[PDB]
């Protein structure tokens, strides 16, 4: 008995199957992250990714920024997080402009790990990525606003 | 088989390892909320102009209207000027 | 670094990094549109010379002016 097996039974594809790669917990959890929901409108997946990251980014900027000890304005350091979301929404935007063209189809795989044919994820399409950037921006600024909305009764505010 | 000149996506491993392909877990109403309020942001060209100009004007506002209580560069020197090694 | 270490080491290192990106979830949704390669041998000599010269000029300009203007004499 052995634990490490070739990637999907093919030894000549550059990868391996390990508990980190191929495991029911890892496979399910990654299959349930919004970036891997290959049948959902990319606008909504962008909303979730934007909400999670915009919410997370507020913490470090507020607690480590220059105005951190000047409590008069340190709570407004979420603006820096919001500015990074703006910058990242530009990085996301300019990425799709160069990667996918208007009439180009999806570059995502049109297969399944079991061989059956599949409908490619619309995220690797020009309009799909545009919806994801718009969703990430909307959820991003919403995540920063909602994170700054909370401030009190926390051990590290 | 693993080598099939017909389908090279299966031959070269062009698979979706962690794609779910399941229907949406996001219920309705909520999705329509985001699909109508995040609608104008999904034009990548318009979003690019909106981000650059909007972000640049936001940066210009908070920089032009800065405060001496927040930035030492605007507060300026509060002490009398020093004296150079020989000159002023 | 650009003048002592040479290319082939960094090319094999970039190959091990390209495999890492293609096999990492979430990030593999982002594809590079230009293949990552190590800097050319002539490019390495130029980049190393430019860092050498910039450091040369800036180090001495800093010492020159600070040691002279600090005394002004």
């Amino acid at each position: 008995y052995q634990v490490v097996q070739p990637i999907n039974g093919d030894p000549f594809i550059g990868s391996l199957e390990t508990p980190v790669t191929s495991s029911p917990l890892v496979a399910w959890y990654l299959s349930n992250l919004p970036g891997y929901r290959t049948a959902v409108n990319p606008l909504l997946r962008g909303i979730e990714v934007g909400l999670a990251h915009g919410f997370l980014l507020v913490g470090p900027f507020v607690k480590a920024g220059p105005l951190r000890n000047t409590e008069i304005a340190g709570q407004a350091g979420s603006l820096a997080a919001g500015g990074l979301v703006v910058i990242l929404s530009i990085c996301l935007t300019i990425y799709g402009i160069s990667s996918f063209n208007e009439g180009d189809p999806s570059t995502a795989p049109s297969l399944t790990l079991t061989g059956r044919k599949k409908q490619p994820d619309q995220l690797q399409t020009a309009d799909g990525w545009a919806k994801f950037t718009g969703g990430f921006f909307f959820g991003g600024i919403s995540g920063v606003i909602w994170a700054f909305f909370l401030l009190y009764v926390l051990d590290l505010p | 088989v693993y080598f099939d000149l017909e389908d090279l996506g299966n031959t070269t491993g062009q698979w979706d390892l962690y794609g779910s392909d399941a229907p949406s877990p996001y219920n309705s109403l909520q999705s329509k909320f985001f699909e109508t309020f995040a609608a104008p942001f999904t034009k990548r060209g318009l979003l690019l102009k909106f981000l650059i100009l909007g972000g640049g004007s936001t940066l210009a506002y908070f920089s032009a209207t800065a405060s001496g209580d927040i930035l030492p560069i605007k507060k300026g020197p509060q002490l009398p000027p020093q004296l150079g090694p020989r000159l002023g | 670094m650009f003048l002592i270490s040479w290319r082939g080491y960094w090319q094999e290192l970039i190959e091990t990094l390209a495999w890492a990106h293609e096999r990492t979830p979430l990030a593999n949704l982002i594809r590079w549109r230009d293949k990552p390669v190590a800097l050319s041998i002539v490019q390495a000599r130029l980049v190393g010379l430019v860092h050498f010269s910039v450091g040369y000029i800036f180090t001495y300009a800093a010492f020159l002016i600070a040691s002279t203007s600090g005394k002004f004499g």
């Binding site: 910058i87 530009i90 300019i94 402009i97 160069s98 | 690019l48 650059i52 972000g55 640049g56 940066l59 210009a60 920089s63 032009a64 800065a66 605007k74 | 549109r33 230009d34």
Partner: peptide
């Protein structure tokens, strides 16, 4: 007051627009 407008306009906005536009031109195809 003018530095408070032009210093970010050349150290933040200008490199942002310049790097993004050069990225689009370099990665463009015909």
């Amino acid at each position: 007051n003018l530095p408070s407008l032009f210093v970010p306009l050349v150290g933040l906005l200008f490199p942002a627009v310049a790097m993004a536009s050069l990225f689009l031109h370099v990665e463009k195809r015909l």
